Design a protein around this ligand. Sequence first.
Ligand SMILES: Nc1nc2c(ncn2[C@@H]2O[C@@H]3COP(=O)(O)O[C@H]4[C@@H](O)[C@H](n5cnc6c(N)ncnc65)O[C@@H]4COP(=O)(O)O[C@H]3[C@H]2O)c(=O)[nH]1
Ligand SMILES: Nc1nc2c(ncn2[C@@H]2O[C@@H]3COP(=O)(O)O[C@H]4[C@@H](O)[C@H](n5cnc6c(N)ncnc65)O[C@@H]4COP(=O)(O)O[C@H]3[C@H]2O)c(=O)[nH]1
Ligand SMILES: Nc1nc2c(ncn2[C@@H]2O[C@@H]3COP(=O)(O)O[C@H]4[C@@H](O)[C@H](n5cnc6c(N)ncnc65)O[C@@H]4COP(=O)(O)O[C@H]3[C@H]2O)c(=O)[nH]1
Ligand SMILES: Nc1nc2c(ncn2[C@@H]2O[C@@H]3COP(=O)(O)O[C@H]4[C@@H](O)[C@H](n5cnc6c(N)ncnc65)O[C@@H]4COP(=O)(O)O[C@H]3[C@H]2O)c(=O)[nH]1
Ligand SMILES: Nc1nc2c(ncn2[C@@H]2O[C@@H]3COP(=O)(O)O[C@H]4[C@@H](O)[C@H](n5cnc6c(N)ncnc65)O[C@@H]4COP(=O)(O)O[C@H]3[C@H]2O)c(=O)[nH]1
Ligand SMILES: Nc1nc2c(ncn2[C@@H]2O[C@@H]3COP(=O)(O)O[C@H]4[C@@H](O)[C@H](n5cnc6c(N)ncnc65)O[C@@H]4COP(=O)(O)O[C@H]3[C@H]2O)c(=O)[nH]1
Lengths: 293, 293, 293, 293, 293, 293
Amino acid sequence: MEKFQILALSGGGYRGLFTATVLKELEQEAKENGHDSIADCFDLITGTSVGGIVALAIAYGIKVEAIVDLFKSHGDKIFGSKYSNESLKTVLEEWFGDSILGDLKCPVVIPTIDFTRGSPVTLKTPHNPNLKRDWKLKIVDVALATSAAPTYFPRHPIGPNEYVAGGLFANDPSLIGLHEADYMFKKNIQDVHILSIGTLSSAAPNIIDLVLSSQQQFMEQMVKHRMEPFPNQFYKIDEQIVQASAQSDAAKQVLEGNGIQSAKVALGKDFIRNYFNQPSRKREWFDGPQKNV
Amino acid sequence: MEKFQILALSGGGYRGLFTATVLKELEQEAKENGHDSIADCFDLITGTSVGGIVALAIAYGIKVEAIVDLFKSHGDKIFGSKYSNESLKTVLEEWFGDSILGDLKCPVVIPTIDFTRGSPVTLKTPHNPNLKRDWKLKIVDVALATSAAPTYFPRHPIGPNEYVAGGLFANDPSLIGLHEADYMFKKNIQDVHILSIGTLSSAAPNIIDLVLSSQQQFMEQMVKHRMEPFPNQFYKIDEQIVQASAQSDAAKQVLEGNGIQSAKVALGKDFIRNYFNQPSRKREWFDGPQKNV
Amino acid sequence: MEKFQILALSGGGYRGLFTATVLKELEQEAKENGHDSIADCFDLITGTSVGGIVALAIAYGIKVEAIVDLFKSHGDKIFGSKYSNESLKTVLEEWFGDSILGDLKCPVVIPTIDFTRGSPVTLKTPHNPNLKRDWKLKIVDVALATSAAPTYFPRHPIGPNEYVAGGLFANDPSLIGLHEADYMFKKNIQDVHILSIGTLSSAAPNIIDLVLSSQQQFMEQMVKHRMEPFPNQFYKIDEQIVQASAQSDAAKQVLEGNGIQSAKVALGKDFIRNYFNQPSRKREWFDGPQKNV
Amino acid sequence: MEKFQILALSGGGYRGLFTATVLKELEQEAKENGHDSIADCFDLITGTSVGGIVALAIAYGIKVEAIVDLFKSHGDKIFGSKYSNESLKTVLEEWFGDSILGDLKCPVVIPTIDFTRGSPVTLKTPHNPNLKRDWKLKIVDVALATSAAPTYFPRHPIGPNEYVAGGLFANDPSLIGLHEADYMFKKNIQDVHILSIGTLSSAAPNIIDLVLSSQQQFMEQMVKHRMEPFPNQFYKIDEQIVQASAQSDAAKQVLEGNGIQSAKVALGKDFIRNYFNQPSRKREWFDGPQKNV
Amino acid sequence: MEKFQILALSGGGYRGLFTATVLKELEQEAKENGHDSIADCFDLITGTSVGGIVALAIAYGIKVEAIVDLFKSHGDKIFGSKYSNESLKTVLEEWFGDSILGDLKCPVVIPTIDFTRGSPVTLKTPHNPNLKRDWKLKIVDVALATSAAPTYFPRHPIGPNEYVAGGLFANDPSLIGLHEADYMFKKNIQDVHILSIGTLSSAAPNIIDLVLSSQQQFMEQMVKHRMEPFPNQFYKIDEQIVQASAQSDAAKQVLEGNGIQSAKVALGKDFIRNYFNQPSRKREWFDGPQKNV
Amino acid sequence: MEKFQILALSGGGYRGLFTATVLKELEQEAKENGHDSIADCFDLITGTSVGGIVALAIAYGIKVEAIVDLFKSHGDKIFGSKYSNESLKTVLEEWFGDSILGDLKCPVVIPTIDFTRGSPVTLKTPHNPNLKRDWKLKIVDVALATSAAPTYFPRHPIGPNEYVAGGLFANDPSLIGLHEADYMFKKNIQDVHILSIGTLSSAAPNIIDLVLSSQQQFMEQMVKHRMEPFPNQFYKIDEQIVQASAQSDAAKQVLEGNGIQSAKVALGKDFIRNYFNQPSRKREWFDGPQKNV
Ligand SMILES: Nc1nc2c(ncn2[C@@H]2O[C@@H]3COP(=O)(O)O[C@H]4[C@@H](O)[C@H](n5cnc6c(N)ncnc65)O[C@@H]4COP(=O)(O)O[C@H]3[C@H]2O)c(=O)[nH]1
Ligand SMILES: Nc1nc2c(ncn2[C@@H]2O[C@@H]3COP(=O)(O)O[C@H]4[C@@H](O)[C@H](n5cnc6c(N)ncnc65)O[C@@H]4COP(=O)(O)O[C@H]3[C@H]2O)c(=O)[nH]1
Ligand SMILES: Nc1nc2c(ncn2[C@@H]2O[C@@H]3COP(=O)(O)O[C@H]4[C@@H](O)[C@H](n5cnc6c(N)ncnc65)O[C@@H]4COP(=O)(O)O[C@H]3[C@H]2O)c(=O)[nH]1
Ligand SMILES: Nc1nc2c(ncn2[C@@H]2O[C@@H]3COP(=O)(O)O[C@H]4[C@@H](O)[C@H](n5cnc6c(N)ncnc65)O[C@@H]4COP(=O)(O)O[C@H]3[C@H]2O)c(=O)[nH]1
Ligand SMILES: Nc1nc2c(ncn2[C@@H]2O[C@@H]3COP(=O)(O)O[C@H]4[C@@H](O)[C@H](n5cnc6c(N)ncnc65)O[C@@H]4COP(=O)(O)O[C@H]3[C@H]2O)c(=O)[nH]1
Ligand SMILES: Nc1nc2c(ncn2[C@@H]2O[C@@H]3COP(=O)(O)O[C@H]4[C@@H](O)[C@H](n5cnc6c(N)ncnc65)O[C@@H]4COP(=O)(O)O[C@H]3[C@H]2O)c(=O)[nH]1
């Protein structure tokens, strides 16, 4: 019985700068405890849309300084269909290149919707004997697929199928982490610790937004309910202070400051600090270039 | 350790003649085994959309002949905002009258969205010591709230709040049943048996439909995954034969016939027949006129 | 032994209708458990600003239906110096009349500032042998003094001294409740249960607002810190859902609905329900018309 | 059980010279009893405003002769927004340089307000296992942030956030000392000894001053009330003689003389002399350049 | 061993309204405890100058409502030599008439200076076998002698001698009370309880004022020193709040309000309330019309 | 129980030749009984005005021949502001030099007034654990401060404060001796023996003189009253013969003859002779260079 820790990077658009600021501060705590990256402290990383461009980068081993550098120097240009995806593609090739999803150092689950069939899809690494087809994809294509919503980006054809943004259906990536730890990893729920670094989003479009918000809250409350018998085993690092804030470079200042303050609040809790004071986790890859089993 | 059985009536619009026909066919077994209604064989009833109306009618003790009579004699008229809700209101008062949600004979969970706050809400009978405010509502108002979607019906103001249809977020009422049996009834998942009598539904609206279908499938697959270690403990009575059917009174014929065939297929499985061959279930009401504890 | 329960009503201006709604739904539980009013379940009541006109009304025995009737029928007119205190005065005489502060059924602490000396003052019922001069005041004058701020109301001269609103300094009436239970009631902090039904408020004025908000948060966090070793012994019923609300009669609707939802959430927690299921509180008055000791 | 002694320096503006004269006299006793500085006799140092530039200097190990030299040779120049923070900045770099807040020899708590979020903040040395982010700051920036009020100094941007003066909210640094000894140090209140070397300050601005004075007195009286059961465990060295004084170099004379007289009065009390006749205090740093634990 | 209680009415000029208001509030406590006047709770009453016009009135049995009526309706006119004492004489005859000093109900000591010899004199009632010549004087003449200072009033010739104001030498009437209790009443100092209701006063004249203030403080500190071994046996009701007051009818308001607040503070202390909860004191007159021995 | 003997040198101006002559005559008995100086027979020495100078000289160990030499050879020159203090300063440096007040061989109390604050001050040797700041002063500065009255000498700035003559307030140094022996030495009054070698002094100035004389007599009579139960324990060596004398070198003759006659009268009383026939007193210094405890 050792703790199965999940990092559920929730977010959307340009508020992602909050998610990368909270992650630069948490990273420091990992280093100071002797880890190579913040991806060595977690057994699973789940993200949706932009949270997936950060989740893949975290698991690949990318320094969080560059994930933040993306949002405060390239954030305007990146974040036909109101965007052309070319700058995002350039930065992602800059980062990854031609690496496949099986080259990640941490198991990830990237939910997304198959527009062709119109059905949920999850792009996962080979962390179970049964996952054998998603480790061959370009990390660039996975990143372009997860962060591709209608009226935001053209749908990305990874292969024969067209995929849209994952936040449309699985707007909470903390239910995916808990579910994946319950059926792929056969983990008892008492051993699951979820850290969800999410953020709040900023007649028909009104209805779509209402449905999306309601569907994120429904799944978040389900995760909170399943983790109530075990105290402090699900903690969400949200900017609950911006809603209490009595008061785009200025917006960068507010986002950065909110991220730093939320990470400071989180590091003051011993159970959050206990995510990073452990021996480096050992992975079990069942396929791909890093096959251990 | 006795089996906690859940009835998850999934349904949308007129295809409800399928859900009411399968329920009318299962009533036959329920009575032949010596029960008063099909609501005496289940510990929880969850439904969204028209399923909610059928779920409330099932739990209230209404004969399933009249629930079917609603769909093949009043189905066209009932199923500004393309409908006026007056015929549905008349039939619901005809059925219920001025009964409160605490007069139900079976615990129910009716998910719905608070349009005012734009957040998930569940209307629940007083079945837990913690449910103390939803047993006072009109069953008519609950039925008008659950089956009230934009472009279908005006939003129903039960009280100070306006509510929209529950199928928008909790499109699968079998995840609600399983969760309730986990966070309210403190039931071990091996003791939970879910019977989901659902049916298949018939650029922006395309995206909304895709998102709704994807969100129903995601939650359905989560329920199927959590119930795989226990064989045959989650069975869905779906019209998987209409998709294999090589070929509005005619539509009534197809819906009825499909319901009868699906119920015939279900009754051929001993584990489905074991839902109805048990002593009548004893309820524990913690508030309202039927308070037992 | 006996749990010392405190009700810390925080309410500024028109969003007092939230405080009056949460208390109409908490009195229901109070009556359903067999109490005469919601003032029989608490051993101390503290309010500042409108929370004091509600705190005095609660302790006097006024039905909470009329406290709500004040905010949705007289709220605009009541809430020179932008407001003639005459309306409130009429409603307060219609409620109280010529009753003195010693006629209250529950000990209250009403903080306020002496503008003459410019120093903190607390108007308290004679609930300690050392309180002997504030039980002689008009409840009407106390209510007009607590809810009297510059640029809102003229300063009220209760006697030879002029008093201004208490929210200016003691913006959190939950630190006053905890302190009074600590220095007047000689209560061990483990026996103190605080229920704070507050609400969020809506270059020099900016600085004043910033200072007031900072001073409310500082004292609130001090109360939260002193009550962390004892779980769930300080619960604040705040409209944390309006800050999550994706969406003046309309404002009345939002305030009412938020109050009802927050009270519903609070009543779902057993420790909140345990405030009202206890034997009636026996008072010890050490002076005034009701001196029992 | 050994005494936990707190030094709560309160000093607004030029009447800080009082706080420096009282300290130089109290350091004499400190040295005569065999200590290196007056920071070796205390287990916590709290300060607000100028009292924070003195509190940091005391804890850093700066000789109190230079803290007094600041007020009688540089006091006019230091004490757009009526004051260019440049002078103070030069003197603070001349004192500290590039030392971080983790290089202090005594735990300090410097309250301040985050203008960006508009919320209370406390800059603390790493004296608890939960304080891990404020030991990295420049002492110069902390000093420029604590002593930065509107209409006095421009707001100081330590990092991504702008901070204003701490005296605006936490005008009494003796409630902060008592609270920190209660929630961070887990100290029994009978073991806490507070020595507060404060001083008295000299239509809208009138209201702001009234609110600030009322908020200082409220918190001071709360500290006095919590420390009444333990005699002489909270002593405030205030210039209560200048208000009894029957009668800017002349002002320097009055301030100096008042400080010397108040320190003489304080040293005549054996319980004050017992703060300095003890073995040197041993610190427990849980992070930073001096981490011992 | 029963407590010997002394009332030392210190005061001066028109601030006497403070002393008369603190005494109306303390009187109420005497009545509420069942005494005829505030002169039945004390064994000795010492006053200087105006405090003597109040001390004589208190001991004579005059209602304190009229002593206050003197200061807020006749205060300007009463308070050649800037002030011909005709109005004061009229009001004193109105009060007393032709009563001798031996008709007082409480022993009093009125210090004064014999201008003829230029030596201290005390006008005392026959409360010792050795006091046999002062009980024959007019109370009007004693009142006109005690409140008669140069540059204020002409010197009053009671008999063959001219007398000036007593505040010139015995500016503190609490040292006189303690001394009398020590040599006339042969009381142990542990049994002496002094309640001093005084107030603060508002090149050669500067020197005279400095000397007078220094001589009042010297004697006050001597009384405080002799009463330190016995806690709370010397309490001075001073307006220490007007020196902390951040802010001639207005002056009447401040004086009255300060008196009411100081009396409220005093009545909150159980040892002050214990002055009035005792059986009525029994006097021993050794000469005059009320001779008991 | 051994006798606590006090020497209260009262004096003013050149009449100080009486005190110096009486002291020179008592030195004869002191030496004839085997003591080093007249300061070895007393436990405390209190003086005001020129008495302070003589008191400091007596305690320092100065031969009384030189104290008399000051008054009959330098008396005219020493005794802007009618004097320049330079001759007195020269003679005092001649005597003391750079010795601090802690180098005295006998505890002394020198009353004086702080002109800055306008409050009583006493300069005391470190004779109690609580006296820790007056032993560092120059004896020359103490002597120049005690003997510095307006219209006589410029005010002497010992440090940051200006001091005036002590005879203005504490015109009788025998009440100071008795009080000190009561509040600092914790001596029973039956063990206190006071020997007061004083002398009689020679429209606004008339009032000042009257007040000063009245204040000296008031305190003298208080000392006489407190020492009546113990016979001959307070004896004042006054020139009561010059007032009976039926009849500036001639004035020197009268002063010295009166001193010799008064000392002759005093030495004829056995209780005065018993001050000097005792073993040398042992001092307890609690601070300064002579610290014994
Ligand atoms: N995702 C994935 N699936 C693979 C791989 N190799 C084989 N498969 C198989 O494809 C099946 C369905 O693919 P899908 O992932 O797109 O739909 C998935 C996905 O839409 C959804 N789902 C998967 N993991 C989830 C999760 N952790 N949380 C919430 N929902 C989830 O449930 C569907 C069924 O998952 P399954 O694990 O039982 O079967 C896989 C799995 O058996 C592979 O490399 N990746
Ligand atoms: N101040 C500080 N907090 C840190 C550090 N590392 C983590 N934290 C955590 O940041 C949280 C937020 O602190 P804040 O400084 O922004 O506001 C603080 C401050 O506004 C207030 N507060 C703290 N100590 C106080 C005190 N002694 N007196 C009065 N008020 C105080 O309580 C807020 C929350 O305190 P907390 O201790 O429970 O959690 C800290 C603490 O757990 C750190 O290096 N410094
Ligand atoms: N539904 C309900 N809730 C009540 C009642 N009296 C008090 N409550 C309390 O109000 C809280 C929030 O009500 P909500 O129903 O509008 O949001 C609910 C609902 O949106 C969602 N939820 C509840 N049961 C669910 C379920 N079985 N499946 C999926 N989602 C669910 O979780 C939210 C919080 O659930 P909770 O039970 O822990 O707290 C309730 C509950 O404790 C009551 O009579 N009915
Ligand atoms: N005189 C003195 N006081 C000191 C020293 N170190 C500390 N103190 C303390 O300073 C307090 C006030 O000093 P002050 O001398 O200016 O006022 C003194 C002085 O004005 C007056 N006083 C002291 N001794 C006296 C006496 N014997 N007779 C008459 N009056 C006296 O009482 C005031 C307070 O006395 P305190 O002894 O209780 O407190 C001292 C004393 O405790 C010190 O070296 N000398
Ligand atoms: N005051 C008074 N004195 C009387 C009376 N009948 C006789 N006497 C005698 O006159 C003597 C001196 O008169 P005095 O009161 O004007 O001076 C008094 C007075 O100036 C002063 N004094 C008295 N009581 C005091 C006190 N309580 N506090 C401070 N100083 C006081 O001490 C002087 C001596 O008092 P004493 O009591 O030993 O002797 C009385 C006393 O024996 C009489 O009716 N009143
Ligand atoms: N409030 C009050 N005080 C009374 C009464 N009769 C006597 N008193 C006494 O008046 C003193 C001054 O009270 P204040 O109301 O003017 O300011 C009060 C008030 O400003 C503040 N305070 C009191 N209770 C508080 C509290 N519970 N929380 C926060 N602050 C508080 O402390 C000040 C002094 O309190 P205290 O209890 O030690 O002494 C009282 C109390 O002993 C009375 O009828 N009411």
